[PDB]
Enzyme design. Structure first.
Site, mmCIF file in Angstrom:
data_model
loop_
_atom_site.group_PDB
_atom_site.id
_atom_site.type_symbol
_atom_site.label_atom_id
_atom_site.label_comp_id
_atom_site.label_asym_id
_atom_site.label_seq_id
_atom_site.Cartn_x
_atom_site.Cartn_y
_atom_site.Cartn_z
ATOM 1 C CB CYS B 109 92.011 -11.832 24.106
ATOM 2 S SG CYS B 109 91.109 -10.622 25.233
ATOM 3 N NE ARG B 112 92.764 -15.520 25.840
ATOM 4 C CZ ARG B 112 93.865 -15.815 25.203
ATOM 5 N NH1 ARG B 112 93.573 -17.033 24.833
ATOM 6 N NH2 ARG B 112 94.634 -15.946 25.419
ATOM 7 C CD1 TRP B 281 88.512 -3.687 30.981
ATOM 8 C CD2 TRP B 281 85.611 -4.275 31.043
ATOM 9 N NE1 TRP B 281 87.540 -4.561 31.584
ATOM 10 C CE2 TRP B 281 86.461 -4.846 31.900
ATOM 11 C CE3 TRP B 281 84.168 -4.696 31.054
ATOM 12 C CZ2 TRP B 281 85.749 -5.945 32.575
ATOM 13 C CZ3 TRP B 281 84.098 -6.049 31.478
ATOM 14 C CH2 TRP B 281 84.448 -6.656 32.234
ATOM 15 C CD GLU B 286 92.633 -2.290 23.972
ATOM 16 O OE1 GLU B 286 92.212 -2.257 23.263
ATOM 17 O OE2 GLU B 286 92.184 -1.743 24.491
HETATM 18 C C1 HEM Z 1 86.686 -7.184 28.883
HETATM 19 C C2 HEM Z 1 87.513 -6.717 28.716
HETATM 20 C C3 HEM Z 1 88.771 -6.921 27.961
HETATM 21 C C4 HEM Z 1 89.530 -6.358 27.892
HETATM 22 C C5 HEM Z 1 90.387 -5.879 29.303
HETATM 23 C C6 HEM Z 1 90.358 -6.960 26.542
HETATM 24 C C7 HEM Z 1 92.327 -6.097 26.260
HETATM 25 C C8 HEM Z 1 92.769 -6.746 24.442
HETATM 26 C C9 HEM Z 1 93.163 -6.100 24.071
HETATM 27 C C10 HEM Z 1 94.655 -5.159 24.778
HETATM 28 C C11 HEM Z 1 93.289 -6.639 22.901
HETATM 29 C C12 HEM Z 1 94.762 -6.282 21.318
HETATM 30 C C13 HEM Z 1 93.596 -5.283 20.720
HETATM 31 C C14 HEM Z 1 94.242 -4.124 19.709
HETATM 32 O O1 HEM Z 1 95.563 -3.729 20.577
HETATM 33 O O2 HEM Z 1 94.051 -4.408 18.616
HETATM 34 C C15 HEM Z 1 92.203 -7.497 22.542
HETATM 35 C C16 HEM Z 1 91.856 -8.372 21.436
HETATM 36 C C17 HEM Z 1 91.057 -8.822 21.619
HETATM 37 N N1 HEM Z 1 90.265 -9.157 21.458
HETATM 38 FE FE1 HEM Z 1 89.485 -8.851 23.905
HETATM 39 N N2 HEM Z 1 89.764 -7.589 25.698
HETATM 40 C C18 HEM Z 1 88.208 -7.088 26.299
HETATM 41 C C19 HEM Z 1 86.949 -8.309 26.088
HETATM 42 C C20 HEM Z 1 87.468 -9.101 24.477
HETATM 43 C C21 HEM Z 1 86.032 -9.461 24.079
HETATM 44 C C22 HEM Z 1 84.367 -9.197 25.265
HETATM 45 C C23 HEM Z 1 85.831 -10.434 23.182
HETATM 46 C C24 HEM Z 1 84.864 -11.499 22.168
HETATM 47 C C25 HEM Z 1 83.824 -12.079 23.007
HETATM 48 C C26 HEM Z 1 87.055 -9.871 23.278
HETATM 49 C C27 HEM Z 1 87.700 -10.403 22.299
HETATM 50 C C28 HEM Z 1 89.241 -10.221 21.398
HETATM 51 C C29 HEM Z 1 89.878 -10.471 20.286
HETATM 52 C C30 HEM Z 1 88.987 -12.392 19.448
HETATM 53 C C31 HEM Z 1 91.198 -10.023 20.420
HETATM 54 C C32 HEM Z 1 91.923 -10.473 18.751
HETATM 55 C C33 HEM Z 1 91.550 -10.662 17.421
HETATM 56 C C34 HEM Z 1 91.917 -8.787 17.482
HETATM 57 O O3 HEM Z 1 91.748 -8.426 17.913
HETATM 58 O O4 HEM Z 1 92.898 -8.899 16.103
HETATM 59 N N3 HEM Z 1 88.045 -9.112 23.717
HETATM 60 N N4 HEM Z 1 91.842 -7.336 23.591
HETATM 61 C C1 LIG Z 2 86.767 -6.122 22.430
HETATM 62 C C2 LIG Z 2 87.602 -5.706 22.343
HETATM 63 C C3 LIG Z 2 87.883 -5.219 23.554
HETATM 64 C C4 LIG Z 2 89.416 -3.993 23.792
HETATM 65 N N1 LIG Z 2 89.536 -3.661 24.633
HETATM 66 N N2 LIG Z 2 90.196 -4.054 22.271
HETATM 67 C C5 LIG Z 2 89.603 -4.823 21.483
HETATM 68 C C6 LIG Z 2 90.479 -4.326 20.218
HETATM 69 C C7 LIG Z 2 90.566 -5.467 18.913
HETATM 70 C C8 LIG Z 2 91.487 -4.723 17.990
HETATM 71 N N3 LIG Z 2 91.021 -5.408 16.881
HETATM 72 C C9 LIG Z 2 91.864 -5.899 15.605
HETATM 73 C C10 LIG Z 2 92.780 -4.349 15.557
HETATM 74 N N4 LIG Z 2 92.069 -3.797 14.343
HETATM 75 C C11 LIG Z 2 92.841 -3.220 13.682
HETATM 76 C C12 LIG Z 2 90.807 -3.622 14.744
HETATM 77 C C13 LIG Z 2 90.045 -4.628 15.300
HETATM 78 C C14 LIG Z 2 88.176 -5.451 21.336
#
Ligand code: HEM
Ligand SMILES: Cc1cc(N)nc(CCCN2CCN(C)CC2)c1
Ligand code: HEM
Ligand SMILES: Cc1cc(N)nc(CCCN2CCN(C)CC2)c1
Ligand SMILES: C[C@H](O)[C@H](O)[C@H]1CNc2nc(N)[nH]c(=O)c2N1
Ligand SMILES: C[C@H](O)[C@H](O)[C@H]1CNc2nc(N)[nH]c(=O)c2N1
Ligand SMILES: [Zn+2]
Lengths: 411, 411
Positions: B109, B112, B281, B286
């Site tokens: 992520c 974070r 958000w 994405e």
């Molecule tokens: C608030 C703004 C946030 C931004 C800008 C952000 C950004 C991202 C991005 C770009 C990814 C890659 C997703 C993909 O490529 O499919 C990601 C993955 C992830 N996000 Fe964040 N995220 C946010 C919030 C959160 C929150 C609130 C949580 C959990 C409470 C979280 C948990 C995760 C996890 C566990 C992953 C990787 C697991 C997976 O998606 O395979 N994210 N995030």
């Molecule tokens: C909380 C949150 C915020 C954000 N900005 N983006 C995401 C995307 C996470 C994508 N995961 C892994 C890939 N999988 C194919 C789908 C689910 C999650």
């Protein structure tokens, strides 16, 4: 033990068994992955023979004569040479095989589809800096082939004791100079500011401009290195113009045609070749993304955005992204309009996927470093982004080595 | 044992000692690196108490009361509950801490920097599908905050035996439908073609268009799942327009505002929360790179290049790269002009570097997955490309889990 890599764009699966023959260590453990660390980290006869045997066993397996008398005699012949001389000498065939498979095994190289068409220049009879210069000039002329670039390597004598190393002190045979300024900023290529100084400390007289080709700093048999100017007729350069923007010529950019790495070490059968310059052709993004747009290199996104009339206030206008693309269209168009060999990151990454498929079929896998194979722009609209890759170390191999000025006894 | 990560754009070094507290395994070995593999791979009371103690020891260390009587009594209190009930229940404070650190520890992520401002909704009193729908509707309304998006998680009852799992069968709370066609091609989002079918097999009546919001398929306490339509007033959408190209409106693209992952498992103190939707958000890329330009998703580079009047014959004209940038300028501009929260890959990656610096100082490191942290376009003109990153597994954590339709006893 027989691992699976998946492609998430095509749902294609390939089974890797070649990683069983892996030998060296990756830096990763069961509890930590270091696959994004850039550089993770005198040989004796006890270690030499297993390495020679392992290499010979795969060489003779490659010419359809595994374990024959010609194999067993060469094994004994080398065993007796390591007994007598505490080292050994490769046959010309083994040298060419060794070199071709160091490229084949280069996990950070997206161009390996070409690995079998490598021209190997045997320079193990070289003894002087001047001889290295001559050998390197012939390498440059051949590999350039008037812009019809051809891959090649020149192999100088192997390391014997340690204090008699052949070394090219340049990191590439052709690089532009880097000069800091009284006001702190940098002219030319900031990457080479230190090496550009060392040449001057050894006596180089710098034309102090932008794209000044550096001289060669060649160290032969441990002796102090010496400066040689590559004949300018041998250094092919491309001026960078754009097929739409005519103001792009006034940027006055140009790049050299021949990418030729000279600071790495070639390992074959446990023998170490400390000077082994090798060359191919550029993927456009090496120039137009990293060389031109790294903050710590030429750093041109500044001016290019200006002349395009771009919103440079907000970060979210993507003015950097938009200017980065124009610069790479121009690098490619310039090279092609001049008939200098180059490949775009789309064709090159597609070819590596097809290379990968060939490798897994006829070899059981293909070590690949995703972090290095994915291009530095437009990553996920290229096929390698969606391709899982297993990274492991096979031999023969190219290895990093310390910069020679940090390790060399002087005078 | 006390490893070093380097940034090759700024020469900044940071020392990682937090990886010592790492517990799970990475899939890598000393001889193979799997850091580009996408998915590398009933709990009993024997394993539960060490996991509870390890979690409680870090919770009580976080509120400046390591090893006090209030700590030791809670340790005994939980030890006796695991003895009696073969499981245990988290305090509300421990639940909020646990959830916030599962995000903090999410190595894939890039967002974070925000981990401590997470709103935690305790839904462990839920018993029915309808209750899940209500809890999820309140989550959506809160997290959306009229476009002033706020991060949040809703936590349904933990797994007890295994056959009584709470599950959101959607992979995200808000996703567009995917319909194959008689001619084989796909309408809407190809990613969700299978899930869109399952809804119909359970009785969904599809409006069979492009951006049709899917219904929720909520499974409570192991019972068969049930369909619920999110009130459309609760689903905020942004129509995608460009600040230069007025024909871009006729592309008729739009996306939902709230990214909300619902198919992952939250692990806290050895307790498993199989339904734990969480939302933040979007980073623009994405939508504008993966969702829109993956070959196996909406796949719009085709049309966008056409309307820009692009050279689509040659691969080396970079027409794909040029159209990819325009699409991401438009996603960002559309969201911002509507005051819906979004971050560009430049601001977001810069914030993660500063987050990383904060983590190494006050925590001893920050697990980070380079392969996932680098954005899918313009990789090396963002700072995280040049940042070495160590990846390791800390707990609390979010984990992948099998899709519930592959594992569920039916009726
Ligand atoms: C608030 C703004 C946030 C931004 C800008 C952000 C950004 C991202 C991005 C770009 C990814 C890659 C997703 C993909 O490529 O499919 C990601 C993955 C992830 N996000 Fe964040 N995220 C946010 C919030 C959160 C929150 C609130 C949580 C959990 C409470 C979280 C948990 C995760 C996890 C566990 C992953 C990787 C697991 C997976 O998606 O395979 N994210 N995030
Ligand atoms: C909380 C949150 C915020 C954000 N900005 N983006 C995401 C995307 C996470 C994508 N995961 C892994 C890939 N999988 C194919 C789908 C689910 C999650
Ligand atoms: C012929 C066309 C070739 C292409 C298109 C190509 C492409 C590339 C690219 C893009 C890189 C990454 C370089 C960087 O980002 O700095 C690379 C690295 C590498 N190349 Fe290839 N290459 C070619 C030829 C060769 C040859 C002939 C050899 C050896 C004989 C070779 C050996 C390597 C090695 C060992 C690396 C990674 C080690 C390192 O650079 O750190 N390449 N290649
Ligand atoms: C043979 C060859 C062909 C090609 N197209 N590109 C290269 C570049 C290799 C860059 N290496 C690693 C990074 N290092 C900073 C500089 C040396 C080599
Ligand atoms: C093969 C590779 O693991 C896969 O395509 C990954 C690469 N990096 C990624 N990075 C992010 N943020 N999201 C992804 O879905 C992926 N996919
Ligand atoms: C931090 C990271 O290891 C470093 O920036 C790498 C990333 N990937 C790369 N990939 C290539 N091809 N070349 C590079 O120099 C780098 N640099
Ligand atoms: Zn690894």
């Amino acid at each position: 033990r027989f691992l699976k890599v998946k492609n998430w764009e095509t749902d294609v699966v390939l089974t890797d068994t070649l990683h069983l023959k892996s030998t060296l260590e990756t830096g990763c453990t069961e509890h930590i992955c270091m696959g994004s660390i850039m550089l993770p980290s005198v040989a004796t006869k006890d270690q030499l023979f297993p390495l020679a045997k392992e290499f010979l066993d795969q060489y003779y397996s490659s010419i359809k004569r595994f374990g024959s008398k010609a194999h067993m005699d060469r094994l004994e012949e080398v065993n007796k040479e390591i007994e007598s001389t505490s080292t050994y000498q490769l046959k010309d065939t083994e040298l060419i095989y060794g070199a071709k498979h160091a490229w084949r095994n280069a996990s950070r190289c997206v161009g390996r589809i070409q690995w079998s068409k490598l021209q190997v220049f045997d320079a193990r009879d070289c003894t002087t800096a001047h001889g290295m210069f001559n050998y390197i000039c012939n390498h440059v002329k051949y590999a350039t082939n008037k812009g019809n670039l051809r891959s090649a390597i020149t192999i100088f004598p192997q390391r014997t004791d340690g204090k008699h190393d052949f070394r090219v002190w340049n990191s590439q045979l052709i690089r532009y100079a880097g000069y800091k300024q009284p006001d702190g900023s940098t002219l030319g290529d900031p990457a080479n500011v230190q090496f550009t100084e060392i040449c001057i400390q050894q006596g180089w007289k710098a034309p102090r401009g932008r794209f000044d080709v550096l001289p060669l700093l060649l160290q032969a048999n441990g002796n102090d290195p010496e400066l040689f100017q590559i004949p300018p007729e041998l250094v092919l350069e491309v001026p960078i113009r754009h097929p739409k923007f005519d103001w792009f010529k006034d940027l006055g950019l140009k790049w050299y045609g021949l990418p030729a790495v000279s600071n790495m070490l070639l390992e074959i059968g446990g023998l170490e070749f400390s000077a082994c310059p090798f060359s191919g052709w550029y993927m456009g993004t090496e120039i137009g993304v990293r060389d031109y747009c790294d903050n710590s290199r030429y750093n041109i996104l500044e001016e290019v955005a200006k002349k395009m009339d771009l919103d440079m206030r907000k970060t979210s206008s993507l003015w950097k992204d938009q200017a980065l693309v124009e610069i790479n269209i121009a690098v490619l168009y310039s090279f092609q309009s001049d008939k200098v060999t180059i490949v775009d990151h789309h064709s090159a990454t597609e070819s590596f996927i097809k290379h990968m498929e060939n490798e897994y079929r006829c070899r059981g896998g293909c070590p690949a470093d995703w972090v290095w194979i994915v291009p530095p722009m437009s990553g996920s609209i290229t096929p390698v982004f969606h391709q899982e890759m297993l990274n492991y170390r096979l031999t023969p191999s190219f290895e990093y080595q310390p910069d020679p000025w940090n390790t060399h006894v002087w005078k």
